Amino acid sequence: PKKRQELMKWNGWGYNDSKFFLNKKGQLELTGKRYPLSGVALPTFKDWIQNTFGINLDHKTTSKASLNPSDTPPSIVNEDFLHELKKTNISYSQEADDRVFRAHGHCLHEIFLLREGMFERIPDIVLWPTCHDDVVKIVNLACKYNLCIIPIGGGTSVSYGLMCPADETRTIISLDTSQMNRILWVDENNLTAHVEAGITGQELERQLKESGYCTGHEPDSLEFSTVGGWISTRASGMKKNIYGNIEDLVVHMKVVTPRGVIEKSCQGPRMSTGPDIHHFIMGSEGTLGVITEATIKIRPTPEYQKYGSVAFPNFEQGVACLREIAKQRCAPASIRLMDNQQFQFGHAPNQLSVATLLFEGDREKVLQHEKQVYDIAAKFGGLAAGEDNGQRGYLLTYVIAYMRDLGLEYYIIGESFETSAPWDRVVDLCRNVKERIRRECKEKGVQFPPLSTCRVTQTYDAGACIYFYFAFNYRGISDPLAVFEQTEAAAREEILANGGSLSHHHGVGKLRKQWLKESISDVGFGMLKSVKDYVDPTNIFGNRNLL
Amino acid sequence: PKKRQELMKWNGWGYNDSKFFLNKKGQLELTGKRYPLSGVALPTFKDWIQNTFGINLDHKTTSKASLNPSDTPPSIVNEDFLHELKKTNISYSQEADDRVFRAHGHCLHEIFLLREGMFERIPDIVLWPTCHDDVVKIVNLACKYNLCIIPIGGGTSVSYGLMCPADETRTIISLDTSQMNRILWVDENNLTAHVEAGITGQELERQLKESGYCTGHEPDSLEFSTVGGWISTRASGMKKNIYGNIEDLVVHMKVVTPRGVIEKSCQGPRMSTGPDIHHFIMGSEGTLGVITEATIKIRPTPEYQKYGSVAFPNFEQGVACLREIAKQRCAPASIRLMDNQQFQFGHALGFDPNQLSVATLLFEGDREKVLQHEKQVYDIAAKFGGLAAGEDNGQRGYLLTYVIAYMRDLGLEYYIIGESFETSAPWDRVVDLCRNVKERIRRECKEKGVQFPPLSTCRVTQTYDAGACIYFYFAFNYRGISDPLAVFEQTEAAAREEILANGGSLSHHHGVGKLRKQWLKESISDVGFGMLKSVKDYVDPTNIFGNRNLL
Ligand SMILES: Cc1cc2nc3c(=O)[nH]c(=O)nc-3n(C[C@H](O)[C@H](O)[C@H](O)COP(=O)(O)OP(=O)(O)OC[C@H]3O[C@@H](n4cnc5c(N)ncnc54)[C@H](O)[C@@H]3O)c2cc1C
C-alpha cells in the first residue's frame, strides 16, 4: 500500500494490529494474530518491567494518536514541475500523512518526536515510481527544477538516514520505492534473482520459496526493509554465516544518478577491473543515486534446521567459546551469546550467560556440525541447555521492536546499538561500554540504574559484532531526549576508544556523521566527497548522510 | 637483493639457475634444484613439442645476450631533487640494468621486446624504501619536484601495469618495495599478520609457518609477487575456496597518497561506515599511491592435505559436475577441470581418450573433514560419469604449477609464442564461452596465415556460487610470419572480444593495466569510469602516480 498508515503505525514500529496491551487478566499480551507470540499472555512480563525500571504501570504517558495537521509544515512545490509530473502518470501525493510517514526512520529520537513534537522539515511531495524508467524521469525532472531527492524504502533506518535537513530550501521529493518491487526473474542455472530494489525481504523470501529458493538474508527489519535499503546501508542479517552479508549476496546492480546510469556489463562472479564500483554504491546511504535493480544470490531452501543452546559459567567463557568456534570456522547459521541479565529476562547464577544456536542445511551435516560445536563448548564449561530452549530464544526476534513502543507508553526510553571489534577487544569493550552507560545516567540525574546489557550476535575471523541495549525510566527528568542523546553519544565514544567500529551494520546516516572522518581518515573522506561531487554535482541527493 | 638480475633472469621468468634445456641424452630438463621437477628428465616432452607445433628442436632463436646499458635512454634527473634524496639515505640507482629490470612485467609482448629489442621508455631512477616513513619522504619529494612514480613489487604484472608510458616526459621513479618486507607482527589472538607490502608470498608463508601459521593465498607467481601487488591487482590464489581471495584476506591497509595517508582507525572484522575505502584501493593498480602495510588474516597450518583426480566422459560433463559441486558448496581447497587436449599432454608425460576431460583436486584441513569432503565430491562426480583416477595422478596434476612460466621462455628459444588469459563468467555461459573462444583463436590464426593450427586449450580454474574462472592457453609456431607480435597482439584482442561477447568478464584476476583499458569504460559504464576518474583527480591531482593503468 501507498498509504502506509492504513496498515502500519505512523508513530511506532510495525503493524497497527500488533501492540502490547494489558489484558482482562492484567497481563501483557500482543494484539493480533500476526506473530507466534500474538495473543500469548506473558504473566511475568509486567513484574519484570516494574522491578527492572521501578514503575507501577499506573500512569501511561499520553501521546498523539494522529498527526496534528496544524503542526505539519506547508508543502512548497513548483507548478511547472507539477505539470510535467502530471504527464508522467507517476503517482504522487502532497498529503501531510504520506509526507510525515516518510520523514523519519526508527531511531528513538524520531519516534519520541512523532509521539510528542513535530519534525523541523519533511518532504514536500512523495512519488511512487514503479520501474527503472520512472526513476530516470524523476531524476531528470529534479535536475531541470533544482529539486532534492531522498529515497526511502522500508523506512526502517536507525541512523537519521531519511531525516530532511532543516535548512534545505529546495522542494524535497521523497522517492518511495515500495511500488518497484518485482522479482524480474529467477535464474535457476546461475542461482541468482534479478529484483527491483523496492521488494521487502519478507516478500522476497515468500516469492522465492514458491520455487524452492531463499536468499537467507534475514535482518530483523525484513518485514519492511528492502533490497535497495540493504545495499544503501550495508545490511547484515541473522544467517550471514551461511548466506553472506549484503556485500557477499549482490552480484550486480543498477543505479540512477544525475550523471547517468551506473551498471556493469557482466554478471560474472568475481572480477579484477579496477576498484570495484559496487563498493562505491554499497553503504552510499541515498547520497548518490537510486538503486533500481539488483541481482542477488539465492540458494535452495535448506533441508533441515535445528535449534540449540548452551549455558556458560560467565560471559567471558562464552566469548572465549565463540572465539574458538570462529577459529575452527564452524559457526552455526546463527549463534548469539547473551549476558546474565538477558538470561534472567529469558528465565521469566548471577554470573552465567547463555548462547542460542540455529543450525541449518543438510540433515546429516547439521548433526555433525552440532556435535562439533557442543564438544568445543564443553571445553569452556559450556553445557547443552536444550533444543527447545534455543528455539524459545529466537521467539522474540520480531517482537522486540514492539516492546520499545510499550516502554514509551510508561515513561521508559530504550534503544539498541551496535559495533564490531577485534576479538581481543570484546571483553573490555562490553564491560566498559556498559559502565559508561550507567555512569552517564547516574551523572545526568537518573533515579534507578538503567537496563544496560550486551550480547555477541555475529562471529567473524577477525572479531565479533556486539549489541548493546540501553533503557531507563525517565519520569520527571527535565529534557529526557537530551539525556538519551548525550548518553548514546557517550556510549559511542566509549565504543570507539575500546577499539570498536562506528557501526557494524546500522550505518552512519546523520547520527554518526561527526565520527566518520576519523573512522576512515581525512583522505578517505575526501575520496567519498570526490565521487559525490562528480556523480551529484549540485547535491540533488540531498539527505546529507555521511559527508 | 636490490640487483635482481644477480639471482633472477633479466629477459625471462624466474631464477637464473632454472631453465629448460636439452640434456646429454637429448631430452628436455629443467636445471638447478629449486622445484620437484628440477633435474628430472622429460623423455617425451621434445616430441610433444614437435608434433604440437610442427618444428624441430634444433634451430635456436638468437636473442640479445645481455642487458646493454647503451641501448637505454639516458637517466635525466633534476640535481636538487638528487641532493635532497642523498640526505635521506634511501638507496637508489640510475644504472641501466636496474632500470630496465623494472620497466616491465611478464606479458608475452614485453618479454619478446626484452629478447630482441628495447622499451620505448624505462624508469630514470630506482628507489628502495625500507619502511612506511621512507615512502612518505619519497612521495613528498615527487610532489615537490614533479616526479612520476611507478610502484614495483615482484614485477610479475601481466597487464602492462609496469610499463612506462612512452610520451611521459617527467623523471619516472621506480619505487621498488622489495626491501620493505617485514612481518611487523603476528597477532595470534585476532589471527592476523601486520606486514609490510613488499614481502613476497614465499617469504610470508615461510615466516608464518615457523609459528605454525599460513595465509593460504597462493597465486602461481607467489615466489615473487608481493602483498602490495596482490592488493593493487586484486589477486586470487589456488586455495581461495578455503582462504578467500585478496579482498577476503585483507583486514586493514595503509596507503601513501600525494594527499596524505589513507587508513581506517579500527580493525573490526566488518563495518558499515559508508562506501568501503579498501575497495577504492584494491584494484587501483598503482594509480593512486603506494600500499605500504596491510593486515592479513592467517590460519593455523592445515592438519592434512590430500590430492585427487577424476576423469569425465567429456569436458561438458566435467563442467556440470563443478557446477553441481559449487551448488552444494563443497568445492575442495582446489579444483581444476582441464580439457581433453590438456589431458593428452599430461598423458604424453570404456572412455574415449580424445573426448575425456580431467579434474585435479586438493583437499586440505582436518583429517576427518577431508575424508567427509572427499566422499561428497566423488559421489557427485559419479553422477556425471566421473570416475576417481587416483591420488598420485592428482598430485602430478599440480607438479607443473611453478614451471609453466619457464616453459614459455623455452618456447621462445624455438620460435614458439605462448600466453595465457583468463576470465570469469556465469555458470550458464561457461560451456559456450569455452567452445567459442578456442575456436575464435584457431580461426584468427588461420586467417592471418599461421602454418599450423595453434595450441588453444582451456581450463576451469575456480568455482563460485555465481560462476567460474576460465583460463585459456594459446601458443603458435611463428617461424616465417612477417610480424609475429602483431599477429599475437591481434589474436589476443580478438579472443578478448569473444570472451566479452560470450558473457565473460574483462578479467578475473590479472587486472586491466594498459593492456585492457580500451574495454574498461564498457565494462563499468561511463559513470563508473567517471567515478574512478574523480577519485584519481582528488587523490593525485598532479598525476604523480603516472603509470596510466585503467583510465
Ligand atoms: C527493529 C529494527 C531491526 C533492524 N534489524 C536490522 C538487522 O538485523 N540488520 C541490519 O542491517 N539492519 C537492521 N535495521 C536497520 C535497517 O532495517 C537497515 O539499515 C535496512 O537496510 C534499511 O532498509 P530500508 O529499505 O528500510 O531502507 P530505508 O530506511 O528506507 O533507507 C535507508 C537509507 O537508504 C537510502 N535508500 C533506501 N532505498 C534506496 C535506494 N533504492 N537507492 C538509494 N538509496 C536508498 C535512504 O535514503 C536511506 O538513507 C533494523 C531496524 C529496525 C528499526
Ligand SMILES: Cc1cc2nc3c(=O)[nH]c(=O)nc-3n(C[C@H](O)[C@H](O)[C@H](O)COP(=O)(O)OP(=O)(O)OC[C@H]3O[C@@H](n4cnc5c(N)ncnc54)[C@H](O)[C@@H]3O)c2cc1C
Ligand atoms: C607466471 C605467473 C603466474 C601468475 N599467477 C597469478 C595468480 O595465480 N593469481 C593472480 O591473481 N595473479 C597471477 N599473476 C599476476 C601477478 O603475479 C599478480 O597480479 C600479482 O598480484 C602482481 O604482484 P607483484 O608484487 O608482482 O606486482 P607488480 O607486477 O610489481 O605490480 C603490479 C601492479 O601493482 C602496482 N603495485 C605494485 N606494488 C604496489 C604497492 N605496494 N602499492 C601500490 N601499487 C603497487 C604496480 O604499479 C603495478 O601497477 C601471475 C603472473 C605470472 C607472470
Ligand SMILES: CCCCCC[C@H]1C(=O)O[C@H](C)[C@H](NC(=O)c2cccc(NC=O)c2O)C(=O)O[C@@H](C)[C@@H]1OC(=O)CC(C)C
Ligand atoms: C531497539 C529495540 C531494543 C529496545 C531495548 C530494550 C529491550 C531489550 O533489551 O531487548 C533485548 C532484545 C532483550 N532480550 C533479551 O534479554 C533476551 C533474553 C533471552 C532470550 C532472548 N531471545 C530472543 O529471541 C532475548 O531477546 C529484551 O527482550 O529486553 C526487552 C524486554 C527490552 O525492552 C525493555 O525492557 C524496555 C522496553 C519495555 C522499553
Ligand SMILES: CCCCCC[C@H]1C(=O)O[C@H](C)[C@H](NC(=O)c2cccc(NC=O)c2O)C(=O)O[C@@H](C)[C@@H]1OC(=O)CC(C)C
Ligand atoms: C605461461 C603461459 C603458457 C602459455 C601456454 C603454453 C603452455 C600451456 O599450455 O600451459 C598449460 C598449463 C599446459 N598444461 C597442461 O596441459 C596440463 C595437463 C595436465 C595436467 C596439468 N597439471 C599441471 O600440474 C597441466 O598443466 C602446459 O603445461 O602446456 C605447456 C607445455 C605450454 O607450453 C608451451 O607449449 C610453450 C612452449 C613449451 C613451446
